[model samples]
Target chain A: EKINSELLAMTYGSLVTQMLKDYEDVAAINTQLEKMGYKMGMRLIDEFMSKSGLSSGACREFKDTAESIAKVAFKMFLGINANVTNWSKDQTEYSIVFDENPLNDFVELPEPIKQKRLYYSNIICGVIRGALEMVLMRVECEYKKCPLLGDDQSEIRVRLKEYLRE
Target chain B: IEKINSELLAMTYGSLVTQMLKDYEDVAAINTQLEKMGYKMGMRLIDEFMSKSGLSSGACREFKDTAESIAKVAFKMFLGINANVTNWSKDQTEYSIVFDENPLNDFVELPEPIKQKRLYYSNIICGVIRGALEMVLMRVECEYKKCPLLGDDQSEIRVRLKEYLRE
Candidate 1:
């Protein structure tokens, strides 16, 4: 009953293809994908806490939290690493650059869809947004660069909004 | 994200599973193979459910409760639907997760041979439930007790507790 990452990626790829076919709106799909990630983040935080044993007080700084997202979140679930860089002067913004996007294992943006500027990995951006929101961090996530659009790497830009004081 | 039509998800998996069935013509063999693959999917997916949903081991201690949770939460998360648990056994060792409509069969029709052989179209689900439960140390047997494609009014997956794995 042990599942491997390859199969998981295939299933996810299939789901994304189906979504694109049904919606046919990249912008609208991006919004939905991010919201989906936000919900997952709300629940996923608990697992991150329990498994990592990170107390609430552990991550008081934004830089540390961002590192955890790059190191822990990406590694534990998808078994990969992301480089966190492009920090803003006030440390309110940064980007997670994925050298290898596992979700694109067997995917290529079809010529017509690629022409429309559709981001194939929009769901991951949503996931990051959702995960951060659960920790009371209001942030805006967007694709700065996408491999699907001929970029060598995929980059997701995260800008801090007002943090909720819960 | 926004609700991607559930039928699309069902059809995607249905197409993939259909391709797998082509590799082997024997219905029972294909069922076993599909269940094994699904069991792996379930095992892996339970981890995602744990990390993403934050389900704790303590919450899953009761076997019946866990089964119901899988029927509710897992079904909703993965398939975009809920399965109702009914026909509980007196000993709580057996039950059925009844689906009012099976999404997997959204675009499926059994050929005469498949129907005559009593092939279960959504057999992957049986593996998923079995694999997910196995991770919790509850070894159980799962089967399609009813299928709409097979002329049943409702689709039901039956589960029976075979034994508990010693932790």
Candidate 2:
């Protein structure tokens, strides 16, 4: 079972810790982590769908898709039973409000990087972007609020840009 | 049992590897970097083992005892599985840790392009062992002699005791 939160958190912490040692800028580290996340998300999409019990076309509407991602995908992978809310009237954007986050389990940002605009969990945005692109839904994901940034709760904003079908 | 789960850790490690491939020029550099990273993690984890292990405070275990202890305790505590201890030298200065399953590369294959050549892929564990033992005053040097990622029958880490430290 590769789902232990401590290992995930430690691996992530080590990743960031190594990056901080190698990089001169916080933004660069954020960018690299996201890029790495994009590749992994593209790779992880199959397992996500297979485990979520949603076969092909199981998530057609954007709302249902958001529900799958917010509820099922998050729970299955990161082991969090997160929630989805704050939908736009246009139905293109919404937020996945996490119940709690595992990525920050043992992480505390250093004071020097605290002043930088570093989305500590920016890889999540990349994972969402890369995972959706594989299923032909080009979307953008952003951190609307983060507990690391002193927010009360962690929020990820998702925007559905285009739905392409063959 | 510590109840270890690995999918997220695997993904996190995979991403770290991806970042390394991007940052380094060649596979050798990445290999060394991976070991360096593992070494740090090992040093930190050794401290975790000593303090949290509830190890009833001892007067230096024999090397033979250390191997079984690591297999029974450290392996399960960290990797969530008891690795097999084999190939001990007659002098007991060396041994091999064998894994029935590789936790880090469970869901991944070394890409075709890279699989054609060298990448210890899981060298982090080698360094992890090195630094782990290093902190315990064992000062071991370790490396992956074989890994399933490169099409080996099994994955094994070979450790050789280099020295004992006073300070």
Candidate 3:
């Protein structure tokens, strides 16, 4: 009954990826995504209602809320528990555990394929941050690749330490 | 509000970031955010493709075949670029595109940092492929097969979706 962000996220991921295959220039393809996201981010709420229930009390505080949403909502719909790492000042260790990553059900990523630049999962990270920010969380999330494996295994970093105050 | 052209927004956003942040920092942020932005775009694109292409699971023989047709229709409809599928092997399936005839190519120009940052602009396509695959659960891998003119090795991106190809 509620709109699902996870489904929306992958649907968008496939769209941009398909477009990139056709368009060679890297800069142009990215622009298209932004333009589309800016508009779609607002429209997506309408779908969120039709598919998934509302996010009431889902995100209590920004600090723990981001991880909670990743754990609860993301897992329920997409079936991936995106682990949250402690933010260390100098440490570089981070990753999301796909213990049961539904998106990668039968996927086997080869070495050559891994090296190619990928921003697939990162988009979902952005959408959540972007969408929630509009709701006033002002969360800033970033994803990085494992140097050797080229996986989207990075912590969803949040900058704002405050709760959404209306 | 007018329909936002994502391609133009990303470049403009990239240029804005280039204006606001240091080169490396800006590119890194742009690269990170652009991919994230693309993912969201992918969701919308899926609906468009299904509705416009009028091709469903029953039309194509397999996910790969469907992917090939989707790419062809997407570009021709939006950017006016016609892409073809090639180098399909047991282990790897690839696509080749010739930008020589594309009108969009005339305006294509890469900033030095974009070339340096490498993944600067490719995330856009990353979003599209991931989007289309979500419909059928293909989980494709995408890459730039050849870019000799840019003197950079042809980059390739591959996404092997975890789900089985349903018909």
What's the TM-score of every candidate structure? Answer: 0.54, 0.79, 0.40
What is candidate 1's lDDT per residue for B127-159, written digit by digit as tens? 888888889899999998788888889888889
Worst 10-residue lDDT window for candidate 1 chain A reads A1-10
Count backbone clashes in candidate 3: 54
Encode model 3's per-residue lDDT on B52-155: one tens digit a residue. 66876566435556546644776565544565554455643444433334322233466665566554344555656665666565655444434422444443
Regions more than 4 Å wrong, model 3:
A1-166, B1-23, B26-29, B91-108, B145-149, B152-167
Which regions of candidate 2 deviate over 4 angstroms?
Answer: A1-3, B1-5, B23-29, B43-60, B68-83, B99-103, B106-118, B131-137, B148-154, B162-167
* Alpha-carbon local distance difference test for all models: 0.72, 0.75, 0.47
Give the better candidate number (1 or 3) by TM-score: 1
lDDT at B35, model 3 = 57
lDDT of 3 at A81: 67
| Fnat by candidate, in order | 0.06, 0.44, 0.00
TM-score, candidate 2, is 0.79
- For model 3, residues A1-166, the per-residue Cα lDDT tens digits are 0112333334343455455555665445544444444443444333343344556555444554545556654654454666666654532223344434433322344444455544333444555555565556765444454322444443445455344668
Ranked candidates, highest DockQ first: 2, 1, 3
At residue A142, what lDDT does model 1 achieve?
87
Off by over 4 Å in 1: A1-3, B1-143, B146-167
Model 2 per-residue lDDT tens digits across residues A1-166: 2324555666787788778877999888878777877877887787787666787676676666788888777877677878878999999999999748888875788777766756788888888888888888888787778888777898989899999877
Q: Residue A85 lDDT in model 2?
A: 86
